[PDB]
């Protein structure tokens, strides 16, 4: 406990300005602001000075300073539940690695088999009941069965609050391993309502936190359903966007590390699902799908979503900017017109580019076709992506299979991995069979038996010696 308690300040820094020269424009009575106005006659936490420099417009490069943070520890939503949650405040420029390291070691988190980065519109809204039901159902199910992290913002608005309701729904059920569904919150420390309540050195392990819906201005509060909360900060209070430059760095760094169980070893796969969203969401969607990281969108209740759901079927280059103009016009209907002509052509470019990559994407088509369940969809999505990745040979079937069994569920592989088109040879499964046993997964064993792996041909001497090295350590 104290180990991490000391470790965090030993490792992390938080930002704060050292240049005290008042802002230009005054805030809501916030005339005591040096362009940031956190708390002082200026934006100062030390001697309210120009940092020995009467140099106006002293940039954050010339104003802000990073120093060990007095804003970590454990927390609890006071007057809301009995469970506790982990939080931490983090500077902007911080190696993604050390965060991952804290997460696994100092927080005791197992390397997960899947990384759902969900996004949408910070706006609040609703959707059809049937769609909402199937969505929350499939999402929480697939997040648990594969042991997947789930990463998003943390404010109490938008689809973040929606999925917060979803995970809380499961924890209301929480049949077993209520800690299964783990969700981490990625928001900006500048936009926090009662944040002072935890600013305390040497750990604030029992950390009460008030909350007040609508009891706040531009600054927001937290959703009250996530499991962990990182807070990014630049040294600025009323500002936005201090999150993405790290979030990208982070999720990318996770798409690289490898897991190795049984005998198999693979790289963690990462797929992102998006909700109603808007323009900026469209920007991020493309900026990801150009990096292999595929996407899945729900056909229903989406401004930037349903438009793509519609254009799903239209072949490329058949999308005129006028089609789009009336589309966005009939869809937005509040900002339907405020779009310059100098951006709608940009949007034609983006959307036509996205639909060009005819594999990394996937419609949902709620109810009518292929709408079996949300999970299986995500599976086929990430799977087809992996398959489309370039290769030399058929070890790609090996890759699909190594995955389908890395995640516990089998239905997938027996459904498609062994359908046809490989003409594999049973002597090309023994590495898998190995990991199938050591991990106590009988179903796959029955499987490869049905596809004829020959025990007598299989259980050789060395392999036998192997299996006797990795018995479950608990056994007498």
């Amino acid at each position: 406990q104290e180990s991490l308690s000391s470790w965090i300040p030993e490792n992390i820094k938080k930002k704060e300005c050292v240049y005290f020269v008042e802002s230009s424009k005054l805030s809501d009575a916030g005339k005591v602001v040096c362009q940031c106005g956190y708390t002082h006659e200026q934006h100062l936490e030390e001697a309210t000075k120009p940092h020995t420099f009467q140099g106006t417009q002293w940039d954050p490069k010339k104003h802000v300073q990073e120093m060990p943070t007095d804003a970590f520890g454990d927390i609890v939503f006071t007057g809301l539940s009995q469970k506790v949650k982990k939080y931490v405040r983090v500077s902007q420029d911080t190696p993604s690695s050390v965060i991952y390291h804290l997460m696994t070691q100092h927080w005791g988190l197992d390397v997960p088999n899947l990384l759902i980065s969900v996004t949408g519109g910070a706006k609040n809204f609703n959707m059809k009941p049937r769609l909402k039901s199937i969505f929350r159902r499939g999402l929480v199910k697939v997040a648990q069965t594969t042991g997947a992290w789930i990463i998003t913002g943390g404010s109490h608005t938008g689809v973040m609050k929606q999925v917060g309701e979803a995970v809380r729904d499961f924890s209301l059920s929480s049949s077993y391993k209520e800690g299964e569904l783990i969700t981490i919150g990625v928001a900006t420390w500048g936009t926090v309502h009662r944040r002072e309540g935890l600013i305390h050195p040497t750990g604030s392990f029992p950390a009460e936190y008030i909350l007040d819906e609508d009891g706040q201005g531009n600054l927001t509060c937290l959703d009250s359903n996530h499991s962990h909360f990182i807070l990014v900060d630049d040294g600025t209070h009323g500002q936005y966007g201090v999150e993405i430059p790290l979030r990208t760095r982070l999720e990318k760094f996770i798409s690289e590390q490898t897991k190795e169980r049984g005998g198999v070893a693979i790289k963690i796969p990462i797929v992102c699902v998006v909700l109603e969203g808007g323009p900026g969401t469209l920007h991020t969607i493309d900026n990801a799908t150009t990096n292999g990281t595929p996407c899945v969108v729900v056909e229903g209740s989406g401004r930037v979503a349903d438009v793509i759901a519609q254009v799903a079927n239209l072949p490329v280059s058949d999308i005129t900017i006028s089609l789009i103009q009336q589309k966005l016009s009939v869809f937005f209907q509040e900002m339907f017109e405020t779009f310059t002509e100098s951006r709608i052509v940009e949007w034609t470019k983006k959307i036509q580019d996205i639909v060009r990559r005819r594999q990394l994407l996937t419609v949902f088509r709620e109810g009518k076709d292929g709408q079996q369940d949300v999970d299986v969809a995500i599976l086929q999505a990430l799977l087809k992506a992996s398959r489309s990745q370039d290769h030399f040979g058929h070890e790609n079937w090996d890759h699909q299979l190594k995955l389908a069994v890395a995640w516990n569920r089998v239905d997938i592989a027996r459904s498609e991995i062994f359908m046809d088109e490989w003409q594999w040879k049973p002597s090309d499964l023994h590495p898998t069979m190995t990991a199938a046993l050591i991990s106590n997964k009988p179903e796959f064993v029955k499987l490869f038996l049905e596809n004829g792996v020959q025990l007598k041909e299989f259980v050789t001497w060395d392999t036998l010696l192997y299996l006797y090295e990795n018995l479950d350590p608990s056994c007498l």
Partner: peptide, 19 residues
């Protein structure tokens, strides 16, 4: 019987140029 009737429940409630 139970697994069979559930199936009834489920069914019954369900029903470019070169650039």
């Amino acid at each position: 019987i139970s697994n069979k009737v559930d199936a009834m429940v489920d069914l019954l409630d369900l029903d470019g140029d070169s650039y």
